[PDB]
Structures are given as structure tokens and as C-alpha cells.
């Protein structure tokens, strides 16, 4: 995916226009750059089981970018040329492709769709065509029911991954009566509820977290 980061794009242009004259004669600069770009463009392209590398988030892409600029700066700062330059430059492009594939594997291990319940939307970048699209994690809206007990304050709806989802404007929830009717108690950017001076008249609830254009994010029932 590093070919989609403008830092890598501008770096390789500066690599050819300035630093290749320090290591290679001018007759093969274009030939070497075609070999360099073919390796970079293969980053994250899910060929073959290697399905997790197909896309990464914006946090992973910046790690691979600054890891790549670190090694590209190492190649230029050396004074090795000849058959050793092409050899080290090729081991470099092969090394960063492994560093990237670790980040993409670590991404899908603990960051890609970590939601235990509900629908989550994550911002991803697809490495083949450099297209950034909203990815949808489809889990059942039913996040179970809580049995909170509180007379003389009474409802936590936030999940640990709610802070990381995208498109979440505000959470609104109501009180489902025995008549199966819903009355919107409150709606706001607050991820909880607190009503002072509770009484024996407040004895079923239901939370609803709403996205912009992806439906309801999470719903959570309650028994007080």
C-alpha cells in the first residue's frame, strides 16, 4: 500500500533524479527504476491464503511508509555501487515487503474488525488500486441484555470499540414499555445514561447506536 503514500511517491522521484547518479552510471537509471517500482507496486497485492494483506488502515500504512523511507535513506547514504548496489537495493525492497507483510498480518490479527457485537465501519486503503473505502464488519446488532439494579441514580451502552468506529454521530435510546412501545428518553453524543432520584416506577430499556449511512451500529437491551 506504500505506493499510495505521497511520501513514498516523492521519495522515489528524488531517488532517481538525485541519488542514482551517485551509485549508477546514467545508462541504466530508467532500467533500475522500473525494477524498483515493480517491487513497490507489489506491496499488499493479495496473490495466491495471503488474504489479510489486501488492505490496511491509515495507521499501518504510515508505519510501513516511515519504515520504507528509513531504508531508502540507508541505501542512498551508503557509498556502495556496482554489483553490490543492485544487490543491497534488491535486498532492501525485499526486506520492506516483509516488514509490510508483518504489519498487514498484525493488522488483521488485532485491529481488523475487533467488534464482538454489532456493525462496525473502518477506514481502509486497498493496496492494488490505492482506493480508500469504508469497510463494514457485519455482526448481529443484538449485544445481549444487561440486568442493572439501582431507589434514591440509574445505563452504560458504550462498547470498547465504539470509539474506533467511523460514521457514529450520536446514540439514541428509548424505554420499551410492557405495551411494546418506545419513548425516546434521551439522544446525545454521550455514551451512557444517568437519571437522578430514581423511583420504583422506572422498573425494560433498549439502546440504539446509529451511523450516518450504514444503519444502526449497535443495539443493547436492559432489564432494570
Amino acid at each position, epitope marked *: 500500500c506504500i505506493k499510495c503514500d505521497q511520501f513514498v511517491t516523492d521519495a522515489l522521484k528524488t531517488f532517481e533524479n538525485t541519488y542514482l547518479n551517485d*551509485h*549508477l*552510471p*546514467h*545508462d*541504466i537509471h530508467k*532500467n*533500475v527504476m522500473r*525494477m524498483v517500482n515493480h517491487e513497490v507496486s507489489s506491496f499488499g497485492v493479495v496473490t495466491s491464503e495471503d488474504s489479510y494483506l489486501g488492505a490496511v488502515d491509515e495507521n499501518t500504512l504510515e508505519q510501513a511508509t516511515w519504515s520504507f523511507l528509513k531504508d531508502l535513506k540507508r541505501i542512498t547514504d551508503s557509498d556502495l*555501487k*556496482g*554489483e*553490490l*548496489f*543492485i*544487490k543491497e537495493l*534488491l535486498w532492501m525492497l525485499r526486506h520492506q515487503k516483509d516488514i509490510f507483510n508483518n504489519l498487514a498480518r498484525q493488522f488483521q490479527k488485532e485491529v481488523l474488525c475487533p467488534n464482538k457485537c454489532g456493525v462496525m465501519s473502518q477506514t481502509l486503503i486497498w493496496c492494488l488500486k490505492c482506493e480508500k473505502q469504508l469497510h463494514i464488519c457485519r455482526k448481529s446488532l443484538d449485544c445481549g441484555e444487561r440486568h442493572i439494579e439501582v431507589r434514591s441514580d440509574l445505563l452504560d451502552c458504550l462498547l470498547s470499540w465504539h470509539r474506533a468506529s467511523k460514521g457514529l454521530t450520536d446514540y439514541s435510546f428509548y424505554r420499551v414499555w410492557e405495551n411494546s412501545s418506545e419513548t425516546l428518553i434521551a439522544k446525545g453524543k454521550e455514551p451512557y445514561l444517568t437519571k437522578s432520584m430514581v423511583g420504583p416506577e422506572d422498573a425494560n430499556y433498549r439502546c440504539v447506536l446509529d451511523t450516518i449511512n450504514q444503519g444502526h451500529a449497535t443495539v443493547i437491551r436492559y432489564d432494570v
Partner: antibody
Framework: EVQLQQSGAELVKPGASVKLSCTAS????????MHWVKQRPEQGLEWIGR????????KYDPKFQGKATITADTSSNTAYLQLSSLTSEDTAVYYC????????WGQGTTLTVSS | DIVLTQSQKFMSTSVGDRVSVTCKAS??????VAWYQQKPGQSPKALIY???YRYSGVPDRFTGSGSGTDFTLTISNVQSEDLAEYFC?????????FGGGTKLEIKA
């Protein structure tokens, strides 16, 4: 058009020393490493060493360090290979090559060592 | 010194079949092997660098693979102009070694 025209055929007595040359065209010699290789019909190819005429440094196959000395003239675009203490085992064809994203050889120089 | 051995001294083929030269390294070269073609009398010509990457002038029928210890150079569609000797060369460590040759003769 990159071309490497090296020295002509040499024929010398055992013990003498030859300095076979190699002139480069189409690229500056200082922007690259330049290697020397000997070839015999029975023992195959053997890598001798390299040189970068930018810094004058040369690396060798340790079994050829007592005989070969690869020097170069950065202003004349010419790489030289000197072989000292010449014996009959040195009768071979000697190639000079450029090696930086591509290998460009010379036509080869035939060294014949016999009294 | 690393010892590259091409087992087949030289192997036969036909005017259209595919041929595949192999050479084994006594140590781990780790994709640092080149291949050369040398017709008799002339200097060799470089075909492949880093075991898989091919130079511009080389025809696409030539292709190489292999990693670590075993390397194979495969000519997919030979022609009479490809009948020559082929060398593999390890440049992973000093000194660079060249191993034996392999001449692609035609069966008769």
C-alpha cells in the same frame, strides 16, 4: 552504445609479467566496479577480482592475490590486469567486465605462457 | 569457497522442447545467483540476475528460478540460436564462484 575493447593476444615466457588492459566506452569507468575473469577449457571460469577506479580499491579471490593486481586509470577509462610470476597454469583467456545492473564483457585476451 | 555444481555436464534437447539447467550450491546463496550464456570463442552474455530477474535484451523464453541452494535456468522454447554453454554464478559471498558449464546440444 557501451563497448569494452581490451588488449591484444599476449605470448610470454614463464616468470615474466604481463599487463593486459581494457578500455571502456559508453560509460565513465569511475561510476562503477570492473571485474576480471579467467577462462580455461578444462577448469571453467574463475573470478579474479574487481576494482572501483573512483577510490582505487580492489578485492580479489585470495588464491589469485599473489599473482593479479587490478589497477585502473580513471582519466583514460581503462582497467588493467597485471599478472606476475607467470607460470604455465596461467595460460587462459582473460575477460574484463563491467557490473552494475548488467554485465558488459570485453572480447577477451588470450595469454599463452610457455618457454 | 562455495562450490556450485551443475550435475549434467551437458544435456541434449530438441529444436522446440523446453530445457532446464540446474546447479547446486554447497551453501546458502539466498537468491544471489546469475546466469550467463557463452557461445564458443566469444565472451559470455548475462541473462539473469538474482535468480529470477532478467536483463532487458534477453528474450522472454529464458527464465530462472530457485532459492537457497537449488537453482534452475529454464529455456522455454529453444531455437538454434540458443545452442551454447550456460553457467550459474554465486555472488552472495567472496570469492565469487562459477561452477561447471552446461552445453545445450541437440539430440541425434
Amino acid at each position: 552504445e557501451v563497448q569494452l575493447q581490451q588488449s591484444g593476444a599476449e605470448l610470454v615466457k614463464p616468470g615474466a609479467s604481463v599487463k593486459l588492459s581494457c578500455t571502456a566506452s559508453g560509460f565513465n569507468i569511475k561510476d562503477t566496479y570492473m571485474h576480471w575473469v579467467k577462462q580455461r577449457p578444462e577448469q571453467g571460469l574463475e573470478w579474479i577480482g574487481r576494482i572501483d577506479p573512483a577510490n582505487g580499491n580492489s578485492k580479489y579471490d585470495p588464491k589469485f592475490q599473489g599473482k593479479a593486481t587490478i589497477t585502473a586509470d580513471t582519466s583514460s577509462n581503462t582497467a588493467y590486469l597485471q599478472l606476475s610470476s607467470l607460470t604455465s597454469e596461467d595460460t587462459a583467456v582473460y575477460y574484463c567486465a563491467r557490473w552494475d545492473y548488467g554485465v558488459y564483457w570485453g572480447q577477451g585476451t588470450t595469454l599463452t605462457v610457455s618457454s | 569457497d562455495i562450490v556450485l555444481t551443475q550435475s549434467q555436464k551437458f544435456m541434449s534437447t530438441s529444436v522446440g522442447d523446453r530445457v532446464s539447467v540446474t546447479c547446486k550450491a554447497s551453501q546458502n546463496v539466498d537468491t544471489n545467483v546469475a546466469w550467463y550464456q557463452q557461445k564458443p570463442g566469444q565472451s559470455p552474455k548475462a541473462l539473469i540476475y538474482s535468480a529470477s530477474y532478467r536483463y532487458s535484451g534477453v528474450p522472454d523464453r529464458f527464465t530462472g528460478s530457485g532459492s537457497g541452494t537449488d537453482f534452475t535456468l529454464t529455456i522455454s522454447n529453444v531455437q538454434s540460436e540458443d545452442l551454447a554453454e550456460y553457467f550459474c554464478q554465486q555472488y552472495n559471498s567472496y570469492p565469487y564462484t562459477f561452477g561447471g558449464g552446461t552445453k545445450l546440444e541437440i539430440k541425434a
